[PDB]
């Protein structure tokens, strides 16, 4: 019986520890055409990226409409209390309840055709994040799970949520869609089926709240929209191609006029595509 559930009971190695080739590099080491599709798409993203822009803002008091132009993708990472109750560490910023998150006026800054990626944790947020998506005018359409391995520190970890039945070893990033998008007709807006809905990395260091950087790769590969917003980002998450807005940023360079100029004439808000990528990407 190659039962990895039993093996976890017996040894403390999580079943996910035995999934092979989960890194960004080793997954397509043996598959040159698969690797080439990713390499060319990453080059397309880098060639068309805006320089990083970022704004310190207390989002609870902020008029979100001050962020312009509208966004093709929004990555939302509100600091949930559960991130700190489950690790035990004291937060150095205000934690956000799901009521707090719901109050955000995300629909006022989303482009009419656009996507959202909402980090929901592993408890009640799987349900309440869906309510937020409804409130903001999105349909839940995928669930990207961040599965955490414990290869370096095998053992159990007590889940503190008193309602939990199992040991919680993953976090969910819900994906929502706004507007009408057809993957056969709208290839200038999305490249579907380039990535899978799983990110597998080792559990972070004791006091580390960062999410895996691969979430950016999945978003950038999927949507050709260049207007990308990361709400509740930090100094450490600043990234070309993204506008980062959050309370703990130490500096601000955002200029709404300059930011918008990167996407208006003679530029486009879409990356475009090359003939080499069009011949390689998955299509009907």
């Amino acid at each position: 019986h190659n039962d990895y559930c039993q093996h976890f009971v017996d040894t403390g190695h999580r079943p996910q520890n035995f999934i092979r080739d989960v890194g960004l590099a080793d997954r397509f080491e043996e598959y040159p055409k698969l690797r080439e599709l990713i390499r060319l798409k990453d080059e397309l993203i880098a060639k068309s990226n805006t320089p990083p822009m970022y704004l310190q803002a207390d989002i609870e008091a902020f008029d979100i409409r001050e962020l312009t132009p509208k966004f093709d993708v929004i990555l939302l990472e509100p600091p949930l209390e559960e991130y700190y109750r489950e690790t035990g560490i004291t937060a150095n910023e205000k934690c956000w309840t799901w009521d707090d998150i719901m109050k955000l006026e995300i629909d006022e800054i989303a482009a009419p055709r656009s996507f959202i990626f909402l980090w929901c944790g592993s408890g009640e947020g799987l349900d309440l994040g869906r309510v937020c998506l409804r409130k903001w005018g999105y349909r839940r359409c995928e669930d990207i799970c961040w599965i955490k391995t414990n290869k370096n520190n095998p053992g159990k970890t007590k889940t503190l949520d008193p309602k939990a039945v199992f040991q919680r070893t993953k976090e969910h990033c819900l994906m929502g869609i706004k507007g009408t998008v057809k993957r056969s007709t709208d290839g200038d807006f999305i490249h579907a089926n380039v990535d899978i809905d799983l990110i597998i990395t080792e559990e972070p260091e004791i006091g580390n709240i960062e999410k895996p950087v691969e979430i950016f790769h999945i978003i950038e590969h999927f949507c050709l929209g260049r207007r990308r917003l990361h709400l509740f980002g930090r100094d450490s998450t600043i990234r070309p191609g993204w506008l980062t807005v959050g309370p703990t940023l130490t500096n601000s360079n955002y200029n709404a006029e300059t930011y918008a100029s990167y996407f208006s004439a003679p530029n486009s808000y879409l990356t475009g595509c090359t003939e080499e990528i069009e011949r390689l990407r998955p299509k009907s």
């Binding site: 559930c5 079943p15 996910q16 889940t159 309602k163 039945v165 199992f166 919680r168 799983l198 999927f222």
Partner: protein
């Protein structure tokens, strides 16, 4: 506690009140996911009306969900009297412990996993929290078999209690479980209390 028991039946019409109460219910229903499928489905209203509530006073529900049933399943779980308290994912691997990353296996992103909602009802006693992780890693086997690892997880959660599986096939029969499904081999019941109630309710058959 008994060896495997099963009832070949249409679950929409079986009077499940004859089966008694169970510490764990598990179901893998053919949800209407609003797409053409090579198997028949149950309508949303047929799912809502399943008499899940009589099967349990205190205990757990395991409900497999996919597509639009991520939301419809949550509706059913709450309607049947449960609160969702966990979500198991089954990561599907190939023969060499790798995820198959290619093809077009979802509508927007490719799919490497299946989801199972975990609900609780009432005040169950005699259960063991935190023995297993909420991630199963297993190859896909034969004709759409959900992973057999789930039975061991559930047995460690609730050892030695009676359990019921809905939409099960012959491979799913297990000791301590009663299995319901329309591709089972007739009717095989061993609990004397269940046998007695079955004869009353269906004197013919």
């Amino acid at each position: 506690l008994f060896p495997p028991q099963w009832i070949c039946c249409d679950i929409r019409y079986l009077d499940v009140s004859i089966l008694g109460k169970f510490a764990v219910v598990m179901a893998d229903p053919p949800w209407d996911i609003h797409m053409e499928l090579p198997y028949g489905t149950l309508t949303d209203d047929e799912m809502r009306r399943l008499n899940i509530p009589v099967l349990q006073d205190d205990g757990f529900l395991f409900l497999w969900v996919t597509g639009r049933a991520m939301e419809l399943g949550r509706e059913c779980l709450n309607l049947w009297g449960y609160e969702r308290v966990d979500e198991i994912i089954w990561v599907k691997t190939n023969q060499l412990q790798r995820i198959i990353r290619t093809g077009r296996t979802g509508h927007w992103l490719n799919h490497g996993k299946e989801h199972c909602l975990v609900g609780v009802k009432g005040n169950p006693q005699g259960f063991n929290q935190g023995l297993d992780c909420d991630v199963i890693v297993a190859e896909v086997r034969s004709t759409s078999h959900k992973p057999d690892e789930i039975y061991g997880m559930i047995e460690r959660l609730s050892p030695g209690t009676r359990k019921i599986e809905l939409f099960g096939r012959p491979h799913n029969v297990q000791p301590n479980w009663i299995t319901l499904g329309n591709q089972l081999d007739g009717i095989h019941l061993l609990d004397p209390d269940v046998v007695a109630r079955f004869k009353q309710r269906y004197p013919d058959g």
